[PDB]
Design a protein around this ligand. Structure first.
Ligand code: A1A84
Ligand code: CL
Length: 167
């Protein structure tokens, strides 16, 4: 039993809800919140900009130190950093950004990072401003993640479109 509420169950381990991931994280304070990161951990817009804003820029400060020490992530890769006031940990995961010409096949590799954590609150990787088809992202999520994932979808028409189209 966990404290996630109001989710539709899609499979044994995947759940979905129309929700603002910032507000969800503040309420649940999950062990792991997933950020839709880029390789530079520059949290400017989309989910990343919103999560960072909610931390009063502490996420960005921590991230800049991480990059200065370690260099950029790989597309498809991840790192674990602090969750600040939102969660115990933030798993920064880099899905391919279609608006940069990155290979959509890397989306499966990106979701594989979730399997290192028993339970996660997450967005759909590569959706929104990363330019991928969210129906595809949900399919890859369901077919790749084996741990318990609670997906927060910001857009209602999409949330409704994702549910009604889910196979
Ligand atoms: C809109 C749209 C697409 C998705 C990424 O696929 N963006 C988000 N998903 C969930 N919570 C969010 N908070 C702020 C942004 C955001
Ligand atoms: Cl977005």
């Amino acid at each position: 039993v966990n404290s996630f509420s109001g989710y539709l169950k899609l499979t044994d381990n995947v759940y979905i809800k129309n929700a603002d991931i910032v507000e969800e994280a503040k309420k649940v304070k999950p062990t792991v919140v997933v950020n839709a990161a880029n390789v530079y951990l520059k949290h400017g817009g989309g989910v990343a900009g919103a999560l960072n804003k909610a931390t009063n820029n502490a996420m960005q400060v921590e991230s800049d130190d991480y990059i200065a020490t370690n260099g950029p992530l790989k597309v498809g890769g991840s790192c674990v950093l602090s969750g600040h006031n939102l969660a115990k940990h933030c798993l920064h995961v880099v899905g391919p950004n279609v608006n940069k010409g990155e290979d959509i096949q890397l989306l499966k590799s990106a979701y594989e990072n979730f399997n290192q954590h028993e339970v996660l609150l997450a967005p759909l990787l590569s959706a929104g401003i990363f330019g991928a088809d969210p129906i595809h992202s949900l399919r890859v999520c369901v077919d790749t993640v084996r741990t318990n994932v609670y997906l927060a979808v910001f857009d209602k028409n999409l949330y409704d479109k994702l549910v009604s189209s889910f196979l």
